[PDB]
Amino acid sequence: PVFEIDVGCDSSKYIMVRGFNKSRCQRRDFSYVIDKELLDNLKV
Amino acid sequence: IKEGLAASDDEGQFIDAIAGTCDSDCLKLPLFFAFYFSATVFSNMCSIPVI
Structure with missing residues (x-):
């Protein structure tokens, strides 16, 4: 028996919030302006 | 659009x-509607003494 052990991350393991999915919920594009509450007028 | x-x-x-x-x-x-209320109220005070 010849085998191999690797130390590192597989780049396939992560953390998901419960009840949240990527594309189960369909929607469209959004746009908004935020101001006066940041640490001057943001459009995102 | x-x-x-x-x-x-x-x-x-x-x-x-x-x-x-x-x-x-x-x-x-x-x-504006309250001031028009007042305007109509005082406009209706005018014709009765004239008649």
Whole structure:
């Protein structure tokens, strides 16, 4: 028996919030302006 | 239409522009209506003494 052990991350393991999915919920594009509450007028 | 579509609101679908004129500061209307109340009230005081 010849085998191999690797130390590192597989780049396939992560953390998901419960009840949240990527594309189960369909929607469209959004746009908004935020101001006066940041640490001057943001459009995102 | 332009790029737009900031927030909107819909349930079964989306991209639904609401009909009719939208108003965010339309609230001078009660003051204008009260002053028109007063104007009509004092306009109706005038014809009776004349007659």
